[PDB]
From a paper:
Citrate synthase (CS) plays a central metabolic role in aerobes and many other organisms. The CS reaction comprises two half-reactions: a Claisen aldol condensation of acetyl-CoA (AcCoA) and oxaloacetate (OAA) that forms citryl-CoA (CitCoA), and CitCoA hydrolysis. Protein conformational changes that ‘close’ the active site play an important role in the assembly of a catalytically competent condensation active site. CS from the thermoacidophile Thermoplasma acidophilum (TpCS) possesses an endogenous Trp fluorophore that can be used to monitor the condensation reaction.
Author numbering:
A (entry chain A): 5 to 399
B (entry chain B): 4 to 384
The structure:
Amino acid sequence: EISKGLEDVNIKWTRLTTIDGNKGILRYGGYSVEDIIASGAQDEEIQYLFLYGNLPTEQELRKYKETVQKGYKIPDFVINAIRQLPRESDAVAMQMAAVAAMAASETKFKWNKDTDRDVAAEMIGRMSAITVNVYRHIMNMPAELPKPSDSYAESFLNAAFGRKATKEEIDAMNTALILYTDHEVPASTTAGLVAVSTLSDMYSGITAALAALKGPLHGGAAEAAIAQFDEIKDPAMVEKWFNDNIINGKKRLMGFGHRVYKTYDPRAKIFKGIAEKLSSKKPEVHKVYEIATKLEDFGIKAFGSKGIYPNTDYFSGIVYMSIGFPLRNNIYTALFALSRVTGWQAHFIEYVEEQQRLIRPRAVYVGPAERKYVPIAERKVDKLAAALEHHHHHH
Amino acid sequence: EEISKGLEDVNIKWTRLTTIDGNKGILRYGGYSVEDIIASGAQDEEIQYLFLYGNLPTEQELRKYKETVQKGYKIPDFVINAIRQLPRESDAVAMQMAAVAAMAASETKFKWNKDTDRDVAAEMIGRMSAITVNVYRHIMNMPAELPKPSDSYAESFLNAAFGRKATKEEIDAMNTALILYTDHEVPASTTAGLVAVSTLSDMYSGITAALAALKGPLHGGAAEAAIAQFDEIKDPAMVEKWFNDNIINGKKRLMGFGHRVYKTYDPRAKIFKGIAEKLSSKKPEVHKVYEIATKLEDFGIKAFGSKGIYPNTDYFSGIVYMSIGFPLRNNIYTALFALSRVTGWQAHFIEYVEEQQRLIRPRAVYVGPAERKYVPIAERK
């Protein structure tokens, strides 16, 4: 029997994350994300939580931040690994090309309990520097690096855009990084787990994670929802669009439904609120929000009874857009990777350090039976010669 | 709650491509034994075609196929530079990964389509040659260069890599090597790539992820490990002693022996040994390694043969590569593996996405902390 999609197959144990799909609770190391955000946590604290297993003291957090900020400095050839690419490239593909360059140069990486967390921490800073430069390259802006500031989110926004971000923007970006840190074991995490299962380096693990994330069944989810709202164009048209395209089944309602949440995504609940506030000050963005909420009611009424509700990516694009990030080049998917790099590395360490096993699944053979090899010369037989071979005079 | 450790007993897909008889020691591609394939003198292109199309090509089909592959000999300057801007101490397979990653990014119009997947794969097999040529050249501080069209892919590869006309013996050996490593089971490289294309990510990303896995020492580096082992023995008269001091006492594993499937001589090793003997005999330092290798081989077989532990493909492969002219450094042999295996990878990705597409998304068992209230940082310790 084939375990299609490895669905319901346990690839590892984890301490990091758990989801209650029926109550809609997402917990990091035991802490609910709703509680984390309501308490005003820094994303750095949640990074620390993932890498160390507990929330940091003030001093620990102070030290952790220093280590992360070392990653703000990346070599020029890593930057050039981005900028030498056609500007049309997917943003996540750009991230992949840079980390692959980085994976190649990191010849002194070793899996080691003494250094794994520092390596990962600095890499989270490098991921900010990379993402900043992916964005600038896509926008035909000069290269630049993140610099230390009061928050990791602020350092990222300010360098990405080359301006001082508002407190509200910084806060929204801080929440986004926290909300996308980890979630079960999707295809990106899984691909990375497979790579490090060979004891390949952390960077290659991330590289493989990005390769899976590039696909439209994993990446592009936040962009798809926006494209859907833009397709509707006007709020008065929502029901007509909803009828012509969703109810009769011509296309899927983007940003609805989930493999685990049979209720409202806790991440979506949080993003919706932020989306309302931030978009309210940008007339063009607020319109997208109004289209989104109007569509939301039609979706819940139609699909709510079948456990199909808004997921995290229904409103996340609107939040990113309010902050200042455009739809093009799947930039939102790159923002997802900036966040998810913490979960990825945390899972890789957990795997390699405490439950290491070479990953090597099977395939069921359903091909041709054994047959003798026929040299190319005798493969296309001359019809006339063949027919004449065992022929005799017959008239 | 049971963990499928290493996914070892999990069927991740079906395949029509490859099968192994571990008791007889037979490897079959689309029903054809590699022994029979090599004895009959097939070009690797015929085997690339067998993997991508499901049958051996006619003369006409092969001719069209070669043309598409040769288009892959021209790759953009930024793919080449994705290699050459890297430190030369970089791992060869890592250089390959960075190159394919840049390519994946530039290929913005790739779409999975039953009508075009194979032409894409064919040209990519040619690009993979172009990439490996330049990975080798960069490691050796040689100028960049591209393969040129000829009747043999193996020859186009060798002539571009070394910048000289390879002998027939060298071409044949490389052609055989490409065939022998085309596909085998579903290792971490095939698997990682399968997980990536299961999101419908592009073929190039799929290759990129496969390379990510292959870079690890539990997957890559096997040919190199065996060579390092013959070199620590240094002399052939020193073999018995080295074998007692390092193997009998369990201090290190006998490299290039044993296999998860073959409980008999690896059919790839049998073919490789013959080539290694012939090709190395003409190069004194390499011949020295072959002589160590065969002498060690006898000890291994008398000691471990009864438990079904015999020489595998990586026992002699390094000697073949060295005789052709490729050095031990930077895991170049693993890059040469990737060069061959790129056919099997793409063939598996196509088989999966076209005919058995399913998003790969396994589970993790939670064994972490129970629920706890968030504590603001002011009140910690």
